[PDB]
Design a binder for this molecule. Structure first.
Ligand SMILES: CC(C)n1nc(C(F)F)cc1C(=O)Nc1ccc([C@H]2[C@@H](O)CCCc3cncn32)c(-c2ccccc2)c1
Ligand SMILES: [Zn+2]
Length: 221
């Protein structure tokens, strides 16, 4: 008696509670992110971030963009958030002259599209390709990333080599005059003879993050 109507109400409650849960999670993440962004712990610690988690969707798009330029470098922006000492990359868009108002109004639509599905994301970094020479930061890249870790902070620098298999680097520059300890050659990389000087010179002015990869519930399509 009322068995059929009970099933419908139970389905409806299940759906209504999912939406409410999604909204609660988004709101908790938003306030938790506004907390750290106002706190700015990365301004005091120079080895703060240690991990970089990249979504399979963001990697797909970045690698696709990287490949499309062939022998020529390519660049774009990355969407994500902070989670303690980890930089999470969830999505990315290619770049791209009056002004870069397009790069600013693209960014807003991505954040907004993600908000709908209850995803909290904002500009977390920039990516670019080194077709054939490896993952590291050129002298010009180190100047770029030092400025980014001043005006765009928190901001990560991703470098993809689409020619040579998973050849990606996630990096953070150290501040001007910061002398750190330890050794950082990590994984060996064969870079050309016409780049080794620029490499070796600047290879101490930044560090590598421990890259990890993930497939989200939404990134399964
Ligand atoms: C974060 C981005 C938008 N950005 N912000 C700021 C400013 F805030 F400082 C400044 C920037 C920014 O365009 N940097 C930049 C610097 C150098 C290159 C080229 C340059 O050397 C030429 C040799 C090849 C190269 C290998 N690695 C970097 N390059 C690029 C760049 C990379 C790929 C495609 C197009 C351009 C961007
Ligand atoms: Zn570069």
């Amino acid at each position: 008696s009322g068995s059929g109507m009970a099933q419908k109400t139970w389905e409806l409650a299940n759906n209504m509670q999912e939406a409410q849960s999604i909204d609660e999670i988004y709101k908790y993440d938003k306030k938790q992110q506004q907390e750290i962004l106002a706190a700015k712990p990365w301004t005091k610690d120079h080895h703060y971030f240690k991990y970089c988690k990249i979504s399979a969707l963001a990697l797909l798009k970045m690698v696709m963009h990287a490949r499309s330029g062939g022998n020529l470098e390519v660049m774009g922006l990355m969407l994500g958030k902070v989670d303690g000492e980890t930089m999470i990359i969830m999505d990315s868009f290619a770049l791209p002259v009056n002004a870069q108002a397009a790069a600013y109004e693209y960014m807003a639509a991505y954040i907004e599209n993600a908000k709908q599905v209850g995803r909290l994301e904002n500009a977390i970094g920039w990516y670019h390709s080194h077709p054939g020479y490896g993952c590291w930061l050129s002298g010009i890249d180190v100047s770029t990333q030092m400025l980014n870790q001043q005006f765009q902070e928190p901001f990560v620098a991703v470098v993809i080599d689409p020619t040579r298999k998973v050849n990606l680097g996630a990096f953070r520059t150290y501040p001007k005059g910061y002398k750190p300890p330890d050794e950082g050659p990590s994984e060996y990389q064969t870079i050309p003879l016409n780049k080794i000087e620029d490499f070796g010179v600047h290879c101490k002015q930044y560090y590598a993050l421990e890259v990890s990869y993930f497939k989200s519930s939404l990134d399964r399509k």
